[PDB]
Design a protein around this ligand. Sequence first.
Ligand SMILES: O=c1c2ccccc2oc2c(Cc3ccc(O)cc3)[nH]c(-c3cccs3)c12
Ligand SMILES: [Mg+2]
Ligand SMILES: [Zn+2]
Length: 299
Amino acid sequence: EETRELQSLAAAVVPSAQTLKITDFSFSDFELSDLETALCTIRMFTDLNLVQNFQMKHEVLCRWILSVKKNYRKNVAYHNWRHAFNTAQCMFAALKAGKIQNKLTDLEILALLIAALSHDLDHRGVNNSYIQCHSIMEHHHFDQCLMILNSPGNQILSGLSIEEYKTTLKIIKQAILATDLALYIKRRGEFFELIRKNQFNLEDPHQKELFLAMLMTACDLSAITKPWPIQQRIAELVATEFFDQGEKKNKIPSMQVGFIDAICLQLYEALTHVSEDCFPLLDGCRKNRQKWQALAEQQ
Ligand SMILES: O=c1c2ccccc2oc2c(Cc3ccc(O)cc3)[nH]c(-c3cccs3)c12
Ligand SMILES: [Mg+2]
Ligand SMILES: [Zn+2]
């Protein structure tokens, strides 16, 4: 069946980005089959000029995508392939519609897309954090990412020179490590402070790296920015994994507001300053806060 899935994917035509709706910040994957998410992923690499600029063979990219998808656990309610897929779609949208693409190099864009898709590989559920803060989980996710990138027939970075390769792996590693909320909390102050004093400069290597980390977090948490009906469903999945280990929702509203205020709002507000075109993420996050708050006050 696996080889059958690869055949089907490899031979299928890839619809335009417009048709796949991957340029929209409000994108949802609920109506898509796994095969369709694989197609959207190919379009992301294609439209970001990655397939061309790095000479990726169609057969290899397809196999790599399927290996990545296969290495997420479907039995985990939220931290699964759909989450990684959505994180990558948000990166694509931020780069295109958010106009962030022009602010980065091709290697950085290549690393960001790969990281987004690979950032939660082999996640076993928040409650099943069984071992055998240096973000131990993120290190495992990266290890899985590297293993797949080095698997025979899955080497989508074979077209890069060794120097490009080492640079890309480093960015990929930092990007995945950045998805550790402890690191976000630890580094956001500097980012907020720089934007505050209007001293933010992407030309500065340290600030460029800091920005890449913040962007990863923004895409990682982007479910919190989706249209209300979508966000409710995503929150339902997170709740399932967190509680149902896969009162009740009488506390979810307040916790959602707590999460939005403590982690999300500031980040999307900062992102909008760096690029006004990313406003929809902030707008969606604000609309969901209002909705959750109304419920928290008992509707
Ligand atoms: O993603 C996270 C999250 C990630 C890492 C660590 C903690 C996190 O907490 C999140 C919440 C708070 C929450 C509140 C009530 C629940 O039943 C479940 C979760 N909502 C979310 C949601 C994320 C996106 C839409 S809702 C949370
Ligand atoms: Mg993670
Ligand atoms: Zn994640």
